[PDB]
Every structure is written in structure tokens, then in C-alpha cells.
Amino acid sequence: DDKAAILELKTYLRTMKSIAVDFTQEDSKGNIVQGKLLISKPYNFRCNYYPPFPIIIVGTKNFVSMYDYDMEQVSRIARDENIFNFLLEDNENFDKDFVVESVVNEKEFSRINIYHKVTERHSEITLNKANKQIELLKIFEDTNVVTIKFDNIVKVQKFDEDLFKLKNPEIYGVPERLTKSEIEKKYVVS
Ligand SMILES: [Cl-]
Ligand SMILES: [Cl-]
């Protein structure tokens, strides 16, 4: 078995603890959106879609929530409806949580098909072997495929803590809306 794929995949999970990613997201429903994804393992992440895509997703150890500016709505995201679940996975937990369905290797790219043992959600991961980075992530939700393209990955040395907070808008008001430049102003690169 091409077990090296898990090794490479595991390596990424161990070394990408604190990153910011410029990404493009495409779906079967026609949406195309760009955004900034901040990951601060063990549990914290912020998916900051750029305008006009009115959604911010903030995940912490206690909660994973979504805010829709257009709907003025706060929601909670089930692990089965979290497309960023693999990126938070600890390597030690990989074998407990995922099973590799298949591996395909072409030139510098390696495509790994995996499935979550609990949520049974299938996903496809593209690995760039030259720089050992994830380039494409595909999530299969019944009749919809969500594709996340990793346009740029940078390591972060310190995050503004409030980037991983989503305060009750009913009490503390609407969360700050951040553009690409605005969000880059609130964390320090390595
Ligand atoms: Cl998953
Ligand atoms: Cl979405």
C-alpha cells in the first residue's frame, strides 16, 4: 500500500499549526468566492470570506459558528457541515478519525481520497510534493461538491485573539467585517 501518502498528509497536519491561507472556493451551486483562512491549532480558526460573500465562520474549542451579515443571522455548524474539519485534525488523531479510500499520484501532485469514520463525509486532498503543501481540497455533500483552492499559505507567528471570537450580536453588536487588507493588519507573519 502507498502508505507514504498518509505520511506526507500527516506531516502537513503536524507542521501547519498556525497559518493564513488565501483561498478560492467553488461549488456546484454556482458560488465562487475568495477569502482568508486563519488556522491556529489546536481548535481555533477563522474563515473570512471577502465581500460581497456575507459569511464569517469562527471556530474555537467550545464552538464552531457562522454569521451571515445579509441574514443578520448566527448559526452553528455541525462537524458534518464543516468543510474545514480536516485542516484542524491533529496528526495523532488522523488514524482514529479518517480512513484513506484511495491514492493517485501524477507528477508533483498526489490526490488522496479519505472518508470520516463518524460523519461518513468523503473528501479529496491534493498534495503538492515539491513544496509539500495542500493545493486543492474537495468536499462531497450528497449532490454538491465544494472545492477549496489554496492560493497562498503563510505561517503566522501571533494572531489577534479576537480573530477567533464571535460575540453575541444581540448584545455586543455586529462583528467587524474584514477585507483582505484589514484582516492582514491583525496578525503577524513569520
Ligand atoms: Cl472530514
Ligand atoms: Cl459555504
Residue 45 is placed in which grid cell?
480558526
Burial 151-187 (b: 16+ CB within 10 A, else e): eebeebeebeeebbebeeeeeeeebeebeeeebeeeb
Contact 157, 190 (CB under 8 A): yes
Resolution (A): 2.6
Is the separation of the CB atoms in 68 and 55 below 8 Å?
yes
CA atoms 89, 83, 38, 16: torsion sign: positive
Nearest Cα neighbor of 150 from 126, 122, 185, 114 is: 126
The Cα 152–Cα 89 span in angstroms is 20
**Cα-to-centroid distance, 74 and ligand 2 (Å):** 14
Residues surrounding ion ligand 1 at CB below 5 Å: 85, 116, 121
In residues, how long is the chain? 190
Write the DSSP string, 52-106.
TS--EEEE-SS-EEEEETTTTEEEE--GGG-TTHHHH--HHHHHHHEEEEEEEEE
CATH architecture type of domain 4-189: Clam (2.50)
Half-sphere exposure of residue 117, counting CA atoms within 13 Å on the CB side?
A: 8
Ligand 1 centroid to residue 54 C-alpha, Å: 24
Task: Break the chain into its structural domains and give their ranges.
Answer: 4-189
Ligand nearest to the CA of 25: 2
Helices and strands counted in the chain (H then E): 5, 12
Would you say 31 and 25 are in contact if contact means Cβ atoms under 8 Å apart? yes
Inter-CA distances, 95 with 90, 118, 149, 179, Å: 10, 12, 25, 37
The answer to whether the Cα torsion of 177, 181, 184, 185 is positive or negative is negative
User: Strand 187-189 vs strand 133-141: parallel, antiparallel, or unpaired?
Assistant: unpaired
Cα angle, residue 190 at apex, residues 84 and 178 outer, rounded to 5°: 55
Q: How far is CA 107 from CA 50, 126, 130, 186, in A?
A: 33, 12, 10, 38
- What technique was this entry resolved by? X-ray
